[PDB]
Design a protein around this ligand. Structure first.
Ligand SMILES: O=[N+]([O-])c1cc(N[C@H]2CCN(Cc3ccc(C(F)(F)F)cc3)C2)ccc1CO
Ligand SMILES: O=[N+]([O-])c1cc(N[C@H]2CCN(Cc3ccc(C(F)(F)F)cc3)C2)ccc1CO
Ligand SMILES: Nc1ncnc2c1ncn2[C@@H]1O[C@H](COP(=O)(O)O)[C@@H](OP(=O)(O)O)[C@H]1O
Length: 258
């Protein structure tokens, strides 16, 4: 296909929850658009200063009225969200995914994705990487590796509060598997009820390039396989290597996705 000059603005909003292929999708969208895609890893590696800003936004988010019409309070919140996303061509992952409705309003020419997978595979992945149960010994290892990266209690608070926001819960028993499974199913159902079908592509792990590229009117990247990264097995190795070497820079050459 011909090469065309793409605008550096949000063109793709992925509502998919963490551990549904968001990092592979981030990589895929950066391969297509050659500009950055938001993801929690963007906060960890490039924008830790953004943590307080997302926390502030979530704290105020209850004041949004879904437009149209646009209220004064909503405009003020939307401006802060636009600022956070300046320079990016897409959003994935926490903390953005719960804002998909608001991002659709801010970026009316953006298209919407939803990544989904088997609910029990999702929970298992979530418990291995993001939210281990309180009494799980692996939680202490995760926390020890995270400190190497400069991640503290505010990072965990952002994960919790952005998951609460996505699930529209005032509080959440994070150790309750049944609650998380029910929230997962309700969240994915509500996305599909909310986004006009013409504007939504539902992706399942394994779908690869073709449905995505068709939806985005781009050629399939030539000779590049669809990304397959961020497995919980690989995250466990990362945590263990951070613990062992006590720096990211000492080991990053061993993790080509970082
Ligand atoms: O929610 N919004 O921000 C919203 C944005 C737009 N379009 C934006 C794109 C650039 N200009 C305004 C149109 C309508 C609404 C709300 O109905
Ligand atoms: O899915 N994730 O990765 C995810 C992990 C968390 N929370 C914390 C809890 C445990 N800690 C493990 C870990 C260490 C280093 C990296 C690195 F690769 F970014 F360096 C990634 C994960 C991260 C929160 C949200 C997401 C959504 O993306
Ligand atoms: N192309 C692909 N095909 C199959 N699974 C994929 C994939 N890309 C990512 N995944 C899976 O998606 C999950 C990561 O999601 P995220 O990037 O949102 O955190 C991992 O699940 P597992 O933890 O079950 O391995 C990973 O293995």
């Amino acid at each position: 296909g011909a090469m065309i000059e793409s605008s550096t603005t949000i063109q793709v909003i992925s509502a998919g929850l963490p551990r549904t292929g968001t990092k592979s999708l981030k990589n895929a969208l950066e391969i297509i658009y050659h500009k950055p895609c938001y993801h929690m890893f963007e906060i960890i590696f490039n924008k830790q200063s953004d943590i307080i800003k997302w926390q502030n936004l979530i704290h105020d988010s209850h004041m949004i009225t879904t437009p149209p019409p646009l209220t004064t309070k909503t405009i003020a919140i939307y401006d802060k969200l636009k600022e956070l996303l300046d320079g990016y061509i897409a959003t994935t992952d926490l903390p953005t995914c719960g804002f998909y409705k608001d991002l659709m309003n801010i970026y009316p020419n953006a298209k919407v994705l939803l990544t989904i997978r088997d609910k029990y595979d999702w929970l298992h992945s979530l418990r291995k990487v993001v939210l281990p149960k309180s009494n799980d010994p692996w939680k202490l290892k995760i926390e020890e590796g995270d400190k190497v990266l400069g991640l503290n209690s505010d990072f965990y608070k952002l994960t919790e509060d952005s998951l609460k926001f996505a699930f529209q819960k005032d509080d959440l028993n994070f150790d309750d598997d049944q609650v998380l499974l029910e929230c997962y199913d309700e969240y994915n159902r509500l996305v599909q009820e909310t986004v006009p079908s013409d504007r939504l592509l539902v992706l399942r792990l394994g779908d690869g390039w073709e449905p995505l590229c068709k939806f985005l009117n781009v050629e399939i990247p030539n000779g590049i396989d669809y990304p397959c990264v961020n497995s919980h097995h690989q995250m466990t190795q990362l945590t263990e290597q951070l613990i062992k070497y006590k720096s990211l820079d000492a080991i990053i050459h061993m993790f080509p996705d970082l």
